[PDB]
Amino acid sequence: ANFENFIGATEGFSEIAYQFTSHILTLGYAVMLAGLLYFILTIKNVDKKFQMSNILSAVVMVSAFLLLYAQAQNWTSSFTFNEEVGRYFLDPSGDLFNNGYRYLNWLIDVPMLLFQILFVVSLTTSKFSSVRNQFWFSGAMMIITGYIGQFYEVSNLTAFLVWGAISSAFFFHILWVMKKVINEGKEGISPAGQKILSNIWILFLISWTLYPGAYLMPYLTGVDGFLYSEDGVMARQLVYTIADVSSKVIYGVLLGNLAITLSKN
Ligand SMILES: *C/C=C(C)/C=C/C=C(C)/C=C/C1=C(C)CCCC1(C)C
């Protein structure tokens, strides 16, 4: 199946790798719940014209809280301690670790995260429906092809890499469209608003690039390096969690700050 089950069925996990991963994943969903309350409670601070962004952030928080909670429970319940060896091994009586929860989260959140910026910034020469459709089509194809490649993570590294490269092509199209959105959105707003948009662009670029980084984490030191191990599992789930918080919560906070700044003439 996946790299997590592979390690869990062969080498097992140290108490530390199992506990660290349970805690990071728990922090992930905990932050989404806090984010949910923040976006609901702050909806009254922005003008009505911009409230769709707060609404879409709130919906992303529900998606991410529920699905990361389900992933967290799946992690903790999938491995059981062996006293002889002193490690956690995959439990054949369990469901086994499943990355489906995260990929479904991506399928839901990606279209809403890309769409929500179009309720805060104004385009100039691009059409709203064109940009929206390109975001949605490429976003969906990114996640779908990456999901396909994930099936080959352990069994066929070649297909894993090829499908990931196909997915990356759609990713680069998204980055290209978003860069245009940001540049049109900077036209005729105040310098304070332009500086927030510049920050949004940088946050977007870095935080979205973390996802492919985590997808490749166990192979980033070769076919038998330091990360082809429980340490690469830990690193993968840490980087996902940093990306989750950044791409969903911080991105949303910054858009709301942009909407407040735009209310000032
Ligand atoms: C909260 C969720 C978000 C922002 C999810 C974003 C997911 C991606 C940017 C996925 C990207 C991928 C690649 C560009 C190549 C490797 C396969 C993916 C699906 C991880």
Residue numbers in the entry: 8 to 272
Sentences from the paper on this structure:
Here, we describe a multi-reservoir, high viscosity extruder as a step towards automation of sample delivery at XFELs. After commissioning the device with lysozyme crystals, we collected time-resolved data using crystals of a membrane-bound, light-driven sodium pump. Static data were also collected from the soluble protein tubulin that was soaked with a series of small molecule drugs. In two commissioning beamtimes at the SwissFEL Alvra endstation, we validated the general performance of the multi-reservoir extruder and determined 13 structures overall.
Second, we utilise the device in a time-resolved serial femtosecond crystallography (TR-SFX) experiment by collecting structural snapshots of the light-driven sodium pump Krokinobacter eikastus rhodopsin 2 (KR2).
